[PDB]
């Protein structure tokens, strides 16, 4: 292989590996924020579904 092909093939390799490296660092920060604040799709632990509530008038009024 000529030097140019290896050289530009190297840059293509470096671009892929640098983009992957940045994403790995951004995922760690997103995970830290989502776990601490709970405002994201991850670490979203279930709560009781409000559709299980019965809103019909009851036997007694105060409720």
């Amino acid at each position: 292989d000529g030097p140019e092909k290896n050289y530009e093939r190297t840059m293509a390799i470096l671009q892929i590996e640098a983009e992957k490296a940045e994403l790995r660092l951004k995922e760690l920060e997103v995970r830290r924020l989502m776990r601490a604040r709970g405002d994201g799709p991850w670490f979203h632990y279930p709560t009781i579904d409000k559709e299980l509530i019965d809103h019909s008038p009851k036997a007694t009024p105060d409720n």
């Binding site: 008038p57 009024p61 105060d62 409720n63």
Partner: protein
């Protein structure tokens, strides 16, 4: 937390219907027909307000 607001003892005075349950039982069917309107207004208030203090009148 705040103060539970309560009506005064003078707001809670009304002439009572001091007859026994067998008397209420005997008249209940005709009582249901005759006194339906104030009765059903009061029950609507109770299930809507969910508060006895809001339906005293």
């Amino acid at each position: 937390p705040g103060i539970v607001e309560l009506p005064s003892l003078e707001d809670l005075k009304v002439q009572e219907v001091k007859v026994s349950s067998s008397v209420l039982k005997a008249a209940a069917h005709h009582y249901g027909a005759q006194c339906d309107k104030p009765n059903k207004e009061f029950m609507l208030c109770r299930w809507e307000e969910k508060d006895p203090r809001r339906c005293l009148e």
